[PDB]
Amino acid sequence: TVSVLLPFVATEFYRRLVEGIEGVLLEQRYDLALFPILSLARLKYLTDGLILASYDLTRLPTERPVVLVDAQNPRYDSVYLDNRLGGRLAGAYLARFPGPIFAIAVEEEPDRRTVFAERMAGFQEALKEAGRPFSPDRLYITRHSQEGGRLALRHFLEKASPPLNVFAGADQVALGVLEEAVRLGLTPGRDVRVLGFDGHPFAEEAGLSTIAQPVEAMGARAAQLLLERMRGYQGPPREVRFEPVLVERASTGTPPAA
Amino acid sequence: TVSVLLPFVATEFYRRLVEGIEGVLLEQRYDLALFPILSLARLKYLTDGLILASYDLTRLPTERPVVLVDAQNPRYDSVYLDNRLGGRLAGAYLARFPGPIFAIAVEEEPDRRTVFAERMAGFQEALKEAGRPFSPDRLYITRHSQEGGRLALRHFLEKASPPLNVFAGADQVALGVLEEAVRLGLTPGRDVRVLGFDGHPFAEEAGLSTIAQPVEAMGARAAQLLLERMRGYQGPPREVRFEPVLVERASTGTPPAA
């Protein structure tokens, strides 16, 4: 009858995630019960299955089938993205441009979660392998907002003059780097080249290059697994891994050739 | 049996609001059902009463009694704060210090809500009445975050040198103005004097002066009215207005005397 999914922050990532689930579940005549969450405790209910987003464990109490999305667990069907890859797609990509490479790391209190830890690890590995190793003195830590991105570009600008490369780490932050750049100088090649993460819809109109995540498909896949399980499927905890892809736009341009 | 309240953003303002409600409701043996909200539509349920926070109408469908808090409505019992006053307490207060007075206005997409519109109106009225009228060229619009406050102080600093006064408009933003100031120079008198809004608990340790709101008491009052109604009270929509108060701390200091 009804399926309940547990999200939190109310970001574009969750809007796309649920659009992906709704698209699927509503085709099979199931209703979706959105349960934004802040840690608590409840053992209810009147739901058939549960879809848990981005956040993992405390081994849940319900008898209902549970499928994790954007998370991994040995005991539950889990759909997730290879964030380390993509961090690499970003590093190896930016490594093809002139000027120092900077990165923005999102630091949100709710990390108990390493999607950013993974992105940053692959970023460093790719940069290293390309001869342009990264350094913490070119890193900036902030919140997931446009203001953080603006604060960051401002930070990088006192360390280097254009041209310079920035790995926002998130499209929202990338919008700020983009915005603050414009509030001053060119965005494609002069000032900074901006590379976001998340491939959000708003990224196309902004001309933002980014490492795109197939968030809807991730939700849709999460829904399908749930159905299979709600429809009697038995077997050990399954797993499905998605891959991000680089999408080049104006905020970045062409490397180009030597 | 159980009472359900509808919040949203998950800010310190709502934590304090609910602590105020829980404190009350749990004394009368009622259970609290937290329902974070993003506009939708549901006519259920298994709840006795509803407490709506910060956001008003679409004339609700439920037969259950509804009491609004931090909001006003001719058809529902409403507890709310006199935000215009306080905006004035802030203006008349800052008007007693040397250096240009700046203000930070919070602009969050979800305004369908004028708590900030009211604070700013009283701010301007008090400033005017004190001979130091405000101007939009000393105003800064941003999001409700510390990053916004930092971006703002940086903005004001290119318009004026210390000493200067800042009306954050929200304690969270005030923390940023405070933080970014320190990342440079003195906070009490040299650089800027910071005056926040909301009197949050974290404001005392930070030494932040602010226009304090009795948020818990507002929630507690909201709860009591609900009980009265859930316990058979009949009569037209009631109303209860709270008043904010200035609390002086180090981020501001003494005016002082001429």
Q: Is residue A145 part of a domain?
A: yes
Same domain, A106 and A29: no
Residue B215, SS3 per DSSP: helix
Q: Is residue A58 part of a domain?
A: yes
Place of tokens 């409701």: B25
Q: Is residue A118 part of a domain?
A: yes
- Per-window interface: A 140-199 vs B, CB < 8 A: 142-143, 145-148, 150-151, 154
Q: Is residue B257 part of a domain?
A: no
For residue B117, the number of C-alpha atoms closer than 13 Å in the C-beta half-sphere is 5
Residue B175 near residue B209, CB atoms below 8 Å = no
Cα separation of A116 and A13, whole Å? Answer: 14
How does DSSP classify residue A26? G
Place of tokens 């998370």: A71
Cα separation of A192 and A80, whole Å? Answer: 31
* Buried residues in B186-219 as b, exposed as e (16+ CB within 10 A): ebbbebbbbbbbbbbeebeebebbbbbbbbbbbb
Q: Before A256, cis peptide (omega within 30)?
A: yes
Closest Cα in chain B, distance from residue A152 (Å): 10
* Contact status of A10 with chain B (Cβ, < 8 Å): yes
Same domain, A62 and A157: no
Same domain, B206 and B93: yes
- What domain range is A23 assigned to? 1-81+213-243
Q: Is residue A254 part of a domain?
A: no
Same domain, B64 and B86: no
How does DSSP classify residue A76? S
Residues of A in contact with B10 (CB under 8 A): 38
Same domain, A125 and A151: yes
Same domain, A232 and A157: no
A141, closest residue in chain B (CA to CA): B147
Of B34, B38, B142, Cβ closest to residue A147: B142
> To probe the interface with B, which of A2, A151, A157 has the most B CB atoms within 10 Å?
A151
Structure tokens given for A132: 């342009």
Which candidate, A230, A140, A226, A129, places its Cα nearest to that of A177? A140
Resolution of this deposited model, Å: 2.8
Same domain, B55 and B103: no
Q: Is residue B18 part of a domain?
A: yes
- Return the number of CB contacts < 8 Å for A and B: 31
Same domain, A97 and A204: yes
Q: Is residue B95 part of a domain?
A: yes
- Per-window interface: B 20-39 vs A, CB < 8 A: 34, 36-38
Same domain, B5 and B124: no
Residue B34, SS3 per DSSP: strand
Same domain, B167 and B154: yes
SS (H, E, C) B121-151: HHHHHHHHHCCCCCCHHHEEEECCCHHHHHH
Same domain, A103 and A14: no
CATH code of B116's domain: 3.40.50.2300
Place of tokens 């199931």: A30
Please state the domain count of chain B. Answer: 2
Same domain, B92 and B147: yes
Other CB atoms within 10 A of residue B30 CB: 20
Task: Give the method used.
Answer: X-ray
* Contact status of A2 with chain B (Cβ, < 8 Å): no
Other CB atoms within 10 A of residue B40 CB: 6
* Contact status of A78 with chain B (Cβ, < 8 Å): no
Cα separation of B123 and A213, whole Å? Answer: 45
- Quote the crossing angle between the two packed helices A171-182 and A146-157, to the nearest 10°: 50
Q: Is residue B256 part of a domain?
A: no
